[PDB]
Amino acid sequence: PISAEEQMIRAFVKSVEYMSPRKIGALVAIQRVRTLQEYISTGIPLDAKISAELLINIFIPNTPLHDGAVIIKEERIAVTSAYLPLTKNTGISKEFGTRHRAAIGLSEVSDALTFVVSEETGGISITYNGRFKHNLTLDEFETELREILLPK
Amino acid sequence: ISAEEQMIRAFVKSVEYMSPRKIGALVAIQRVRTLQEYISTGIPLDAKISAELLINIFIPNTPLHDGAVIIKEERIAVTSAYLPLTKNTGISKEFGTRHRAAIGLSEVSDALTFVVSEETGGISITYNGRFKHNLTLDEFETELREILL
């Protein structure tokens, strides 16, 4: 048996392994200490158990659920399609998109852990406490998730 | 506002999208007889029912789309579940594996199951050994309402 936190990290890694080489855009915000309820209220309610397969199905392009942010709360997908604050992007390379602006903006006003798969490049990135970590390998991505979510 | 009313609205809207697009769908609704043996074969979601989620689940060539969705107590309990296929012999070529699963489940349970054919977009329902096929959208909604409400 393995924890819900462990299962959730495994699901994130597997979903990103699928989405990145396919350049499927994804935006997943994980609530930590600071409540994300104000943003959850803007999404489509799922209140679903997390699996790699559901995360992939959510982000498949041109589906009712793929635009906007998935928000995770207490090891459940509370909503999809939530609206996150967008950071100002003066001077930012053209390669980054609205998903990166939403992840950075959320990290500037909360302690949430947010990750992005770029629709433009398939790049993997994470925001946390105002820091932007981009062009991660899958293994570096997993290491960041574990360091933050399992700070053992 | 009832859970049953909300669930029926979501079924109807999901089928309004899938039927003209010939998107195959297989949704089994637990009634009195428990479907736990089949739920155990699927991918756990335990999710609120919405038309948006039902549509997203069944999009072709996606991880969740193969197999049956099973509804339990007005949640999506699982997707991708295996149902028993009927051995009823006389079933036309028009009907495929989703239909045989719906028929097979109705033979051994009081579940209400509906199917959208991936070959024709046709809508059908199985319930208590009966097979109602080629329903119009309005006939489909009427059956759901008669059986579930």
Residue numbers in the entry:
A (entry chain B): 85 to 236
B (entry chain A): 86 to 234
From the paper:
The enzyme CdaA, which synthesizes an essential second messenger cyclic di-AMP (c-di-AMP) in many pathogenic bacteria, has emerged as a promising candidate for the development of novel antibiotics. Additionally, c-di-AMP regulates the bacterial stringent response, further underscoring its significance. The synthesis of c-di-AMP is mediated by enzymes possessing a diadenylate-cyclase (DAC) domain.
However, suitable crystallization conditions for unliganded LmCdaA could not be identified. Therefore, structurally related CdaA enzymes from S. pneumoniae, B. subtilis and E. faecium were cloned, overexpressed in E. coli, purified, crystallized and evaluated for diffraction quality.
